[PDB]
Amino acid sequence: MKDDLDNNLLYRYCGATSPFWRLPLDSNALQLAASEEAVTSHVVPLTPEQAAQIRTMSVITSSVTLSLSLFGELVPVHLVGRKVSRKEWAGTASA
């Protein structure tokens, strides 16, 4: 099992070890929020292919792992979630 004391670059970047994420149908900016009520706006600009990969998720929960560049370092980010509405995907992330 991963050691929970391993430095977590999501925590350093957006303020949560397991942030909530959202990806719309009209933008390739991945939103990372420390809470579902948070008002700030940490984003990761996904490439078109990365965003298309998230959008293969259906309305049933599944997982996709993306290699995101945080602080110039490639971090495997594990996105669990689903298509939550006609035009939005959302879930929780870990890293």
Numbering used by the authors: 1 to 95
Article passage:
DSFs are a family of fatty acid AIs produced and detected by a wide range of gram-negative bacteria, including important pathogens. The DSF receptor RpfR is conserved in numerous gram-negative bacteria, including, among others, Escherichia coli, B. cenocepacia, Cronobacter turicensis, Serratia marcescens, Yersinia enterocolitica, and Enterobacter cloacae. RpfR was predicted to contain three domains, namely Per-Arnt-Sim (PAS), diguanylate cyclase (DGC), and phosphodiesterase (PDE) domains. BDSF binding to RpfR was previously shown to trigger its PDE activity, decreasing the intracellular concentration of c-di-GMP and favoring biofilm dispersal.
We observed that the undescribed region of RpfR (residues 1–117) was highly conserved among all RpfR homologues. Indeed, we found that a construct containing the first 95 residues of RpfRCt (RpfRCt) was soluble and well folded, as determined by size exclusion chromatography. We determined the X-ray crystal structure of the RpfRCt(1–95) to a resolution of 1.2 Å using the single-wavelength anomalous dispersion (SAD) method. RpfRCt(1–95) adopts a Profilin-like fold consisting of an N-terminal α-helix and a central six-stranded antiparallel β-sheet with a single α-helix connecting β3 to β4. Distance-matrix alignment (DALI) and PDBeFold searches of the Protein Data Bank (PDB) show the closest RpfRCt(1–95) structural homologues to be PAS, Ca2+channels-chemotaxis receptors (Cache), and cyclic GMP-specific phosphodiesterase-adenylyl cyclase-FhlA (GAF) domains; however, canonical PAS domains contain five-stranded β-sheets, and Cache domains are periplasmic domain proteins that contain an additional N-terminal α-helix that extends through the membrane. Like RpfRCt(1–95), GAF domains contain six-stranded antiparallel β-sheets; however, unlike GAF domain proteins, RpfRCt(1–95) does not possess a pair of interacting α-helices below its β-sheet. Consistent with the fact that RpfRCt(1–95) is neither a PAS, Cache, or GAF domain, protein BLAST (BLASTP) searches using the RpfRCt(1–95) and RpfRBc(1–94) amino acid sequences return neither PAS, Cache, nor GAF domain proteins. Based on the above structural and sequence analysis, we conclude that while the RpfR N-terminal domain is structurally similar to PAS, Cache, and GAF domains, it is a new domain with a Profilin-like fold. As detailed below, this RpfR domain binds to and negatively regulates RpfF; thus, we refer to it as the RpfF interaction (FI) domain. Finally, superposing the structures of RpfRCt(FI) alone with the structure of RpfRCt(FI) in complex with RpfFBc reveals that RpfRCt(FI) undergoes minor conformational changes primarily at the RpfFBc binding surface.
